[PDB]
Ligand binder design. Structure first.
Ligand SMILES: NCCc1c[nH]cn1
Ligand SMILES: [Ca+2]
Length: 213
């Protein structure tokens, strides 16, 4: 049985967190697959490197250790939704973030509580590549449990995330996240009139989830 411990993010975790996020997203992420070609592994690591110091300073993020091997198997990256760094993104990931803001912005700024320390934004999650399905499932349950604990302990009102894969969408639902938007990703229109995810099947959704704590 997999037994785990959540440790707050520290400055020396940078490369381990990057390796997990890159391995967890590059050529796997459900939105970026439609921007091919031109999704580079360094596009993800460039973003994390720009935000790394503030990410650690805000003290809302954590890694998950396997306490039997003392190695990191997962990580949850969080910010206050109203107090997030903005990075100029020179990569094609900028369209993903603009799409996510298209989903989140209207809901966040007009329907969720105003002020800082209200909305805990679950920004990225990931698990190590070598985890088998039992370990992956267990680590995701452990990270969801721990995001809730951080939210309560840090006195946030709730947890806000856009879930873009079927697994994270279904996990959100069994953890009783409320659906605020279920958007068909192939209908999103970029500023140049194109549809960057237009080739995606009609069934691929971006679901904006919210859970009060
Ligand atoms: N949490 C938003 C899902 C996502 C996709 N790509 C990057 N992030
Ligand atoms: Ca999520």
């Amino acid at each position: 049985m997999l037994k785990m411990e959540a440790v707050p993010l520290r400055l020396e975790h940078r490369q381990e967190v990057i390796d997990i996020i890159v391995a967890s997203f590059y050529n796997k992420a459900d939105l970026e697959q439609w921007l091919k070609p031109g999704v580079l592994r360094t596009d993800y690591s460039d973003i994390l490197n720009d935000i790394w110091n503030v990410l650690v300073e805000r003290d809302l993020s954590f890694v998950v250790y396997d306490t039997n091997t003392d190695r990191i198997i997962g990580t949850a990256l969080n910010f206050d939704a109203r107090n997030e760094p903005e990075v100029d993104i020179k990569s094609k990931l900028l369209i993903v973030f603009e799409f996510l803001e298209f989903c989140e912005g209207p809901i966040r700024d007009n329907y969720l509580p105003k002020g800082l320390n209200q909305i805990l934004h679950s920004f990225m999650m990931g698990t190590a590549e070598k985890l088998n399905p039992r370990e992956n499932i267990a680590c995701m349950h452990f990270m969801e449990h721990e995001v809730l604990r951080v939210a309560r302990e840090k006195q946030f009102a709730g947890i806000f995330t856009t879930n873009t894969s079927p697994l994270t969408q279904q996990l959100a639902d069994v953890y009783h996240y409320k659906t605020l938007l279920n958007f068909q990703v192939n209908e999103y229109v970029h500023s140049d009139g194109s549809r960057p995810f237009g080739d995606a099947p009609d069934e691929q959704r971006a679901i904006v989830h919210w859970k009060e704590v």
